[PDB]
Write a protein that binds this ligand. Sequence first.
Ligand SMILES: *[C@@H](O)[C@H](C[C@@H]1CCNC1=O)NC(=O)[C@H](CC(C)C)NC(=O)OCC(C)(C)S(=O)(=O)c1ccccc1
Lengths: 299, 300
Amino acid sequence: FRKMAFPSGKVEGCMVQVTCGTTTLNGLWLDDVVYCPRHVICTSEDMLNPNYEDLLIRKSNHNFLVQAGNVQLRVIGHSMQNCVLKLKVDTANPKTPKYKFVRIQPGQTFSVLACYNGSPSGVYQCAMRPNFTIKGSFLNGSCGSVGFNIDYDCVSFCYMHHMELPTGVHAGTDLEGNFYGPFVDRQTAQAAGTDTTITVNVLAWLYAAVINGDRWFLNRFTTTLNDFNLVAMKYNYEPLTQDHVDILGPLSAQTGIAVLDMCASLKELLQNGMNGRTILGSALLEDEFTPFDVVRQCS
Amino acid sequence: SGFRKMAFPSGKVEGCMVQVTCGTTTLNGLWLDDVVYCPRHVICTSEDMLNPNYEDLLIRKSNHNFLVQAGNVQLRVIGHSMQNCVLKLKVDTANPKTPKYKFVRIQPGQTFSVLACYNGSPSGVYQCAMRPNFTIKGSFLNGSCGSVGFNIDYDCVSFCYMHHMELPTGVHAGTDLEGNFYGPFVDRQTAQAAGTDTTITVNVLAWLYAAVINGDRWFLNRFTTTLNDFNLVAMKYNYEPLTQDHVDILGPLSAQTGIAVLDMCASLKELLQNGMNGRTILGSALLEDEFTPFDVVRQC
Ligand SMILES: *[C@@H](O)[C@H](C[C@@H]1CCNC1=O)NC(=O)[C@H](CC(C)C)NC(=O)OCC(C)(C)S(=O)(=O)c1ccccc1
């Protein structure tokens, strides 16, 4: 198995740079709107604790420099939506794909197109942790880089980058500007809650091992969802939701192993350990492949 | 700032991918200027594949036997020829989206991005290294042939890999864009085995430095080692020997962290002999060897 990203070209075609004074980050150019983190309007001394509404009233359209490459895009309107700035521009992006804005759930994966000064550098796959951080690779200048999934021809944008925390993980918002998790776009002291293991993805991984013929760990028993959830929390696993049960549907049908039977098999691994064995050639359970990622790479 | 296995943005390559059909075989082609490149085994039937006389099979083919599609559009093949294991299909049109490009042959231990395609449509992108035994550990299913691997320096795409086959161990094999295989493989429908794989030592060392740079250093130690004594232990565990050029290439990481290369070698030597006894590095229970020194630096 591999951490596989979506091809990034449809998103590369939407990346621009937004500058206020000397502050330069990335923005997302879709139709005739550019989306970017509102803190582009902050000075350093203002990042310590900004009054974004007061900073915005002092702004005019002609204080924003939007560039695709080195070509200026004139700004003809501005507004703030939560923690994102929306800049109306005078040119509709001819490379605009079919798109949607979606707010993902913890555990869901997405590709990140890491960008600096509106220029993409790399693409990689991230899982949204249960504590609403992601394990990214972002340097200064990376804010406004986006995360997305591609469904057929349609790009679903789910993440815009805003921050690095002390523990080295990253945090950001959806494309409507709402942070994932409890964080705020201020240069004040913040910290991610303790993380947990993404149970639904571990379960997907067990299904993947079974599809590939590796099935020593299946037992002859089942469990209730609440029983499994109460046990899982004692091992710092995320409790399953009904949505998790539902998205394991295809893998359950592909293998003939009901979700709750796989849960009983996982519970036994949690309670008894691996006892020296491996699954898909590893003593560790993997939690960064969703049910969809598994299908993608097997079928 | 975090360390992640990262592929190049794939857009310049997406704009070159097309579908190529001959007979009952569809796979991917790479359309640069007015030429489409693809694996030549697209011309084979079931029976052909076990011992295909490709020069023989190719001369019996017409330009009109090749259906090339770029999305909703068929491109007219006006000529065909073969270079080693790659078929070249001249078309009446030039690809407008052709990037600045070159064809390169990579060395084992070097890394590249793979754009996995099916029916000419990009499906995923990921990073691979050319293994010392000239396989690559990819994710490729039926219909992936013609998927390409590449690097990008500035705005120049250097193409280095085109996908042809899976081995029974689940690793992958293919050619450069001149059609020459990496390794001892052949585009005939046989189960083939690779030579013994070995671990890319200079890459494990780059990764360990990355693990330090990101605030992880449990595996470190106060011991040191000569280069030759490290190499003796490395070879015992089927790790590649480290050359003085590899040492040099690791300087920037050495400098950046103030850990002498040979000190990181003594750390690695300890891990090889002792295992990780439960512990992990940058998340992994295993020593990762598909990050080059450049990949680590660029990302730090
Ligand atoms: C894009 O503007 C940039 C991207 C960062 C830079 C390095 N890696 C990244 O991902 N984002 C910022 O600089 C943040 C801007 C604020 C308005 C949100 N600042 C930031 O991330 O600062 C971190 C905090 C909030 C000060 S922290 O999490 O408390 C912290 C403290 C000390 C050390 C690390 C983190």
